[PDB]
Amino acid sequence: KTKIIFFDIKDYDKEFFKKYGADYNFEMTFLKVRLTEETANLTKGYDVVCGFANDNINKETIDIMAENGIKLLAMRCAGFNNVSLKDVNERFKVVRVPAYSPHAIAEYTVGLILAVNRKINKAYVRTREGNFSINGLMGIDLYEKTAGIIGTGKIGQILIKILRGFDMKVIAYDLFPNQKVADELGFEYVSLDELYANSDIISLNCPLTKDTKYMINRRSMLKMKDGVILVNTGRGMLIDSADLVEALKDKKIGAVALDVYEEEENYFFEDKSTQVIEDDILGRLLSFYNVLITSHQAYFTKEAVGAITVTTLNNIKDFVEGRPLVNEVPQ
Template sequence: MAIRIAFFDAKSYDRENFAKVNENFGFDIQYYKERLSLNTVSLTQGADAVCIFVNAECDARVIERMAGYGVKLIALRCAGFNNVDVQAAKQFGIRVVRVPAYSPHAVAEYAVTLMLALNRKVYRSVYRTREGNFRLGGLLGFDMYGKTVGLIGMGKIAKELVKILRGFGMNVLAYDLYPDEAFAKEHQVKIVSLDELYEQSDIISLHCPLTKETQFIINSDSITKMKYGVMIINTGRGKLIKTADLIDGLRSHQVGSAALDVYEEEANYFYEDRSDKMIDDDKLALLLMMPNVIVTSHQAFFTREAVHNIALTTLQNILDFSEGKELVNEVK
């Protein structure tokens, strides 16, 4: 009997990619457009595994219900697992797997895209020229060459980003609890403390996981330690930044600009078309109005190669579980 998978938050591109890859696996996948939550957990009845994404609500109450329905595996089709109560899953005998490395190139390249677009005001220029306005006022940027970028986190994505930034002739600082000293030496990355990174960086880019220790790592205290006019890039998780404090920093010009591919309270907005509705999140609405802020829809991962790798690794994780093999991508 084929393994049955309850697939939540399914978009058209998810169905297309997973259906194609599943031709080689033969799983029974039931796609649901809803996100997993306490209100939708009943859809997991009869499923052996659930497949969820970044905005699923997978707390202890949801996990207990799923265990009662017979679910034995939570398969995240993303790298982060901060939205899953891993301890509760262990308590109720449900294993958790993820996709730790679908395409570090995709996210690294997107982080650079945001840096360049924000610095050179590309988004503002496009809007202007479409209206016949070819003035240069307000579009002044700076040379990336010779500037200092500080990376918080030094995992696979950050390492790919380092290679790109060094190609621009930039100085790279990095903070990580367990830094790869050999890589840093090879690519001329200076390992520093967090305070040193704040003080010396012209651009700060976030590439650390969301944990209790890193939640709101960018806040009013850390912002006051940064260079005046610093650029902040976040392609990681929204709650790495305390939004209210970022807004205050932008207002005071301590933060010169910010590009956010993720947002602290993104679940009700990202991946949905809300163009015909008023945005009732005041902080998000304010960020969208600021001329020195770019907000995109959690799309840094979104390349053909990445979505294929996500589908392939997710279904391989499920196959390994069904065959009793070692789960190399298990969250423990």
């Protein structure tokens, strides 16, 4: 009887929500379109809206939603940078799924590092055509190199542990360093500049905020070591992509793996192979021998997707029963 409208849905999302939703007393409607100001009108008559990471939940969208009497905005993801929280004004509540599986993203990040370092993705395309030459595929041992992690949160700290198992030296930067964890894991907090100057490999694992937007830009990349391997499974807006293209052309950047991209919203998760990709930077990034782009799949495991579904359904059950909202996103 609680009526739920879901945006940006794929078949994998739907199957999970139908299966696990069978034990909840919900009406579930599934839409393919992203939630934006153009589609916000479709929320009319629903109690709960379920949004995802690439929905444009700006003021206009939020106004139309409150106007339509929406009681709850449920985000089926850990990120909320794309919802303009100040504009909600407590006219409805916002919940997210914060800890479905930090391991999924940390593990993926390690995958991406090794893929671009050891050029696994290029190897595969060669051996498929029967090219078994390995010229140009030489990488570097991670062992005893320095990895620099920006964001020592749930994901960042698991990433650090893994890398320490590789016997990498790890340095890290966080707005709120946690020295205890550093002693347990065996890593040293440093400034951003020290991280840039000493890191052979750099990974972004902080949220997108006003302070992190474009934190990786021409100026910060000039401070990195030539041949630095950079990986981003955070948010696309962490990197000024145009500057990334230049730092690739300058051979500052040894290789880069991007699971997210600043203007990904009309592309990612969709098969755009039969039309023009209109974003110039995205097209150009796809033509670099040492760029690996994957469509925001760091989160994408069966454990992670399972927990997102269950935690999302419970977030909603908990709201309708007037229970305390453990996964509220404070506004």
